[PDB]
């Protein structure tokens, strides 16, 4: 900022950056749908895991 | 864009594949088979089963009873010779 001797805008866009300093948040919104996908996955997984454990000893 | 899931789809897979038929065939083929020639009943007697056991098994299998049966016809008609001529 001390580079520009005729400054006039650096405090303006400085305040513009500090305005948008709470920039924008992300989304860990998935707490309803992702549990459904891991539910189907763990269901099929435990079914297959117990099935092959039975079929090996059979 | 998402997690694909073919590691665990063996649930309704294990009917369709081809050696499943051979597997379910010989699990049925192997249970009721007697173990080691058991329940053989190697001796039985009905006044002629000893004749089969001495002559007509897989072990002896020699043509001698035929020979005996040949002599049987030699035993038969010759006596009828003494009844006829």
From Swiss-Prot, chain A:
One of its GO terms (molecular function) is proton transmembrane transporter activity. The gene is ATP7. Mitochondrial membrane ATP synthase (F(1)F(0) ATP synthase or Complex V) produces ATP from ADP in the presence of a proton gradient across the membrane which is generated by electron transport complexes of the respiratory chain. F-type ATPases consist of two structural domains, F(1) - containing the extramembraneous catalytic core, and F(0) - containing the membrane proton channel, linked together by a central stalk and a peripheral stalk. During catalysis, ATP synthesis in the catalytic domain of F(1) is coupled via a rotary mechanism of the central stalk subunits to proton translocation. It is found in: Mitochondrion; Mitochondrion inner membrane. The keyword NADP does not apply. Keywords: Acetylation, ATP synthesis, CF(0), Hydrogen ion transport, Ion transport, Membrane, Mitochondrion, Mitochondrion inner membrane, Transport. GO terms for biological process: proton motive force-driven ATP synthesis. Transmembrane segments: none annotated. It comes from Saccharomyces cerevisiae (strain ATCC 204508 / S288c). F-type ATPases have 2 components, CF(1) - the catalytic core - and CF(0) - the membrane proton channel. In yeast, the dimeric form of ATP synthase consists of 17 polypeptides: alpha, beta, gamma, delta, epsilon, 4 (B), 5 (OSCP), 6 (A), 8, 9 (C), d, E (Tim11), f, g, h, i/j and k. Present with 6820 molecules/cell in log phase SD medium. One of its GO terms (cellular component) is proton-transporting ATP synthase complex. The chain holds residues 60 to 117 of 174 of the full protein. The keyword Membrane applies. This is ATP synthase subunit d, mitochondrial. Belongs to the ATPase d subunit family.
Swiss-Prot record, chain B:
Its main location: mitochondrion. Disulfide bonds: none annotated. One of its GO terms (biological process) is proton motive force-driven ATP synthesis. Keywords: ATP synthesis, CF(0), Hydrogen ion transport, Ion transport, Membrane, Mitochondrion, Mitochondrion inner membrane, Transit peptide, Transport. Transmembrane segments: none annotated. GO terms for cellular component: mitochondrial inner membrane; mitochondrion; proton-transporting ATP synthase complex. It is found in: Mitochondrion; Mitochondrion inner membrane. Mitochondrial membrane ATP synthase (F(1)F(0) ATP synthase or Complex V) produces ATP from ADP in the presence of a proton gradient across the membrane which is generated by electron transport complexes of the respiratory chain. F-type ATPases consist of two structural domains, F(1) - containing the extramembraneous catalytic core and F(0) - containing the membrane proton channel, linked together by a central stalk and a peripheral stalk. During catalysis, ATP synthesis in the catalytic domain of F(1) is coupled via a rotary mechanism of the central stalk subunits to proton translocation. This is ATP synthase subunit f, mitochondrial. It comes from Saccharomyces cerevisiae (strain ATCC 204508 / S288c) (Baker's yeast).
């Amino acid at each position: 900022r001390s580079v520009l001797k005729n400054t006039s805008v650096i405090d303006k866009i400085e305040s513009y950056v500090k305005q948008y300093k709470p920039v924008k948040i992300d989304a860990s919104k998935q707490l309803q749908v992702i549990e459904s996908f891991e539910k189907h996955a763990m269901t099929n997984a435990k079914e297959t895991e117990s099935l092959v454990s039975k079929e090996l000893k059979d | 864009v998402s997690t694909l899931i073919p590691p665990k789809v063996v649930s309704s897979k294990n009917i369709g594949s081809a050696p499943n038929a051979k597997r379910i065939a010989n699990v049925v083929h192997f249970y009721k088979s007697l173990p080691q020639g058991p329940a053989p009943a190697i001796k039985a007697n009905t006044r002629l089963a000893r004749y089969k056991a001495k002559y007509f098994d897989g072990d002896n299998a020699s043509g001698k009873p035929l020979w005996h049966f040949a002599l049987g016809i030699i035993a038969f008609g010759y006596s009828m010779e003494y009844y006829f001529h």
